[PDB]
Amino acid sequence: GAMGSMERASLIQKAKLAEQAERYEDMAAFMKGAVEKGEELSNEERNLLSVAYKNVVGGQRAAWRVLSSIEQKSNEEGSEEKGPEVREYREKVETELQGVCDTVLGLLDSHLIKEAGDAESRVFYLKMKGDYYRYLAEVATGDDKKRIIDSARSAYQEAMDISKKEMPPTHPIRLGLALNFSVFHYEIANSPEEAISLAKTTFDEAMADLHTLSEDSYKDSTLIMQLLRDNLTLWT
Amino acid sequence: GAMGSMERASLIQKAKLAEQAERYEDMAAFMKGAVEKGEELSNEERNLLSVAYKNVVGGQRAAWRVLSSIEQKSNEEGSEEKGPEVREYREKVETELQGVCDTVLGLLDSHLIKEAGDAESRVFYLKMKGDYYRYLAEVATGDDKKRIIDSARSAYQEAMDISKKEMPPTHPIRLGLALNFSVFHYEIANSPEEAISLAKTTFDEAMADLHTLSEDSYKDSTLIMQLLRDNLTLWT
Amino acid sequence: KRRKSV
Amino acid sequence: KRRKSV
Numbered sequence: 182g183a184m185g186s187m188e189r190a191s192l193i194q195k196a197k198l199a200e201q202a203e204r205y206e207d208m209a210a211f212m213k214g215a216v217e218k219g220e221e222l223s224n225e226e227r228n229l230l231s232v233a234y235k236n237v238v239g240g241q242r243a244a245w246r247v248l249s250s251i252e253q254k255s256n257e258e259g260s261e262e263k264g265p266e267v268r269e270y271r272e273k274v275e276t277e278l279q280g281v282c283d284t285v286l287g288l289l290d291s292h293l294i295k296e297a298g299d300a301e302s303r304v305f306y307l308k309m310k311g312d313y314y315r316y317l318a319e320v321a322t323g324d325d326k327k328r329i330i331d332s333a334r335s336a337y338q339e340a341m342d343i344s345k346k347e348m349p350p351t352h353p354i355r356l357g358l359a360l361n362f363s364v365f366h367y368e369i370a371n372s373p374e375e376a377i378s379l380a381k382t383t384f385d386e387a388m389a390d391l392h393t394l395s396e397d398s399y400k401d402s403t404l405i406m407q408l409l410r411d412n413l414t415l416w417t
Numbered sequence: 418g419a420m421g422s423m424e425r426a427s428l429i430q431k432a433k434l435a436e437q438a439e440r441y442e443d444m445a446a447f448m449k450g451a452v453e454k455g456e457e458l459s460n461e462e463r464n465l466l467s468v469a470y471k472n473v474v475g476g477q478r479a480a481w482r483v484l485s486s487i488e489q490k491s492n493e494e495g496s497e498e499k500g501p502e503v504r505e506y507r508e509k510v511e512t513e514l515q516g517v518c519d520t521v522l523g524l525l526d527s528h529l530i531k532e533a534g535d536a537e538s539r540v541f542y543l544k545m546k547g548d549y550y551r552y553l554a555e556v557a558t559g560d561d562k563k564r565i566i567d568s569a570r571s572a573y574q575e576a577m578d579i580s581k582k583e584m585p586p587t588h589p590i591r592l593g594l595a596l597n598f599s600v601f602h603y604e605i606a607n608s609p610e611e612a613i614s615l616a617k618t619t620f621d622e623a624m625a626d627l628h629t630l631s632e633d634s635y636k637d638s639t640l641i642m643q644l645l646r647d648n649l650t651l652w653t
Numbered sequence: 654k655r656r657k658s659v
Numbered sequence: 660k661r662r663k664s665v
């Protein structure tokens with residue numbers, strides 16, 4: 182593509198530099214170029230790909246929420262007619278966010294998921310698939326909203342099924358997947374009970390397997406376990 | 418331009434929304450569209466224009482410094498040869514930063530400065546002219562560096578001459594101009610003595626005029642006076 | 654305040 | 660740490 186003439190290793194080196202410079206749009210474009218080289222990603226490279234886009238879409242989502250909240254206030258009784266600008270600009274931000282999601286989903290479908298045979302790669306990509314459909318669902322308001330939602334559910338559920346069969350209950354990818362699937366239940370699928378049960382059960386099964394870990398793996402798992410606990414505290 | 422079909426007032430409304438959403442690239446593009454309508458800017462609109470670009474270039478400058486520091490470390494004795502990537506990516510960021518500066522300087526030259534007759538508009542634009550030449554000087558390493566430097570000096574000096582004749586010593590624009598011209602002396606023109614004298618004298622003349630101000634104007638002036646004091650503390 | 658995701 | 664500008 183745009184990154185067609187750059188060496189794969191140079192793209193990776195540059196993605197790491199853009200991360201250090203907090204240049205996440207650049208980071209993401211370098212990683213998209215690396216994926217498009219056609220070779221599978223290593224563990225480190227999957228982590229770079231995920232960080233790049235999560236940061237980019239995370240800035241777009243925060244912006245969309247600011248603008249959506251302004252837009253709703255302007256639609257309240259007694260608010261003065263501001264004209265079309267707030268809706269137009271929210272739509273602009275929304276469209277760009279949707280294009281980022283479509284780009285990630287594109288990479289996963291062409292051809293990351295189909296070549297991912299190990300549990301750690303396959304679950305990682307399926308979690309990303311559920312995440313980007315979930316970001317689409319956050320902004321969806323039309324006839325496709327139910328289908329977007331259930332594409333998020335189906336990707337998360339396939340990732341859960343594999344992670345349960347193939348990964349220990351403390352694996353960070355298993356834990357991060359459950360945390361996000363649990364947020365999907367709470368916030369997207371209007372199933373706060375399912376959200377809470379999943380976060381509880383995931384946390385308790387991780388607790389009971391901590392004993393098997395080195396001190397460095399202990400540190401990695403308890404970090405995400407803490408985020409499960411934060412949501413349980415907020416939700417109960 | 419790109420914003421040729423949007424109403425001036427809509428561009429301004431959208432710039433304010435992009436500020437709230439922290440979308441400074443968008444904010445800057447809307448303000449560039451508003452300037453290109455050909456009408457003079459009000460006080461509020463000048464402030465929006467300045468905030469938009471200062472944020473955009475400020476992110477590019479921070480990134481450039483991260484990358485420049487990496488690049489210098491790789492050029493130190495005993496550092497392993499990393500190849501051309503760090504230089505290439507620093508150059509990429511540098512080129513984009515230079516294009517932002519050239520765009521602002523373009524707006525000021527076509528045709529903001531020439532139509533700015535009141536001191537508050539004219540000094541404000543000249544300060545911006547010195548600032549964007551100063552950002553160019555930060556990255557300049559070739560045969561044009563001396564000319565870039567003295568374009569920054571000349572713009573700041575014309576702004577100082579007008580502000581001294583036409584503005585009170587506590588005016589925020591006068592104070593912000595002196596603060597930045599003083600940084601230019603310290604950091605760009607290798608004149609830390611001139612930098613210190615300017616910050617001292619500016620601070621002391623503002624102190625002696627505080628008595629003339631309302632409580633709200635007092636608050637605005639002392640805020641920038643504090644930044645002059647911070648630099649004097651750092652530099653002495 | 655805002656729920657956590659990762 | 661870093662000098663101030665505005």
Ligand SMILES: COC[C@H]1CC[C@@H]2/C1=C\[C@]1(C)C(=C(C(C)C)[C@@H]3CCO[C@@H]31)[C@@H](O[C@H]1O[C@@H]3COC(C)(C)O[C@H]3[C@H](O)[C@H]1O)[C@H](O)[C@@H]2C
Pocket residue numbers: 227228229231232305306308309353354356357358401404405659
């Ligand atoms: C597709 O979903 C990806 C999520 C699921 C949970 C988390 C994943 C994200 C990353 C890559 C990692 C985690 C943390 C928990 C380490 C961060 C949390 C969000 O982004 C990163 C993965 O961690 C990896 O990457 C980190 C990069 O940043 C540093 C901090 C340098 O440290 C690195 C860790 O040492 C490394 O193990 C963590 O194993 C899993 C994969």
Ligand SMILES: COC[C@H]1CC[C@@H]2/C1=C\[C@]1(C)C(=C(C(C)C)[C@@H]3CCO[C@@H]31)[C@@H](O[C@H]1O[C@@H]3COC(C)(C)O[C@H]3[C@H](O)[C@H]1O)[C@H](O)[C@@H]2C
Pocket residue numbers: 463464465467468541542544545589590592593594637640641665
């Ligand atoms: C070309 O150089 C512009 C600088 C020179 C010093 C400072 C200018 C910047 C802005 C617009 C303003 C100041 C502060 C000191 C108020 C900020 C500091 C950097 O950016 C803004 C100008 O302040 C104005 O804009 C602010 C926007 O943000 C809020 C906070 C809402 O409050 C607004 C103030 O009430 C308004 O007076 C301040 O008067 C002068 C013009």
Ligand SMILES: [Ca+2]
Pocket residue numbers: 300347348349
């Ligand atoms: Ca296993």
Ligand SMILES: [Ca+2]
Pocket residue numbers: 400401402404
């Ligand atoms: Ca960790």
Ligand SMILES: [Ca+2]
Pocket residue numbers: 536583584585
């Ligand atoms: Ca005057």
Ligand SMILES: [Ca+2]
Pocket residue numbers: 636637638640
């Ligand atoms: Ca103020």
Ligand SMILES: [Cl-]
Pocket residue numbers: 269270273431
């Ligand atoms: Cl728009």
Ligand SMILES: [Cl-]
Pocket residue numbers: 413414415416417
């Ligand atoms: Cl609680």
Ligand SMILES: [Cl-]
Pocket residue numbers: 195505506509
């Ligand atoms: Cl590059």
Ligand SMILES: [Cl-]
Pocket residue numbers: 649650651652653
């Ligand atoms: Cl000191």
Ligand SMILES: [Mg+2]
Pocket residue numbers: 188189
């Ligand atoms: Mg090759």
Ligand SMILES: [Mg+2]
Pocket residue numbers: 221296297298299
């Ligand atoms: Mg394979």
Ligand SMILES: [Mg+2]
Pocket residue numbers: 424425
């Ligand atoms: Mg018109």
Ligand SMILES: [Mg+2]
Pocket residue numbers: 457532533534535
């Ligand atoms: Mg005029």
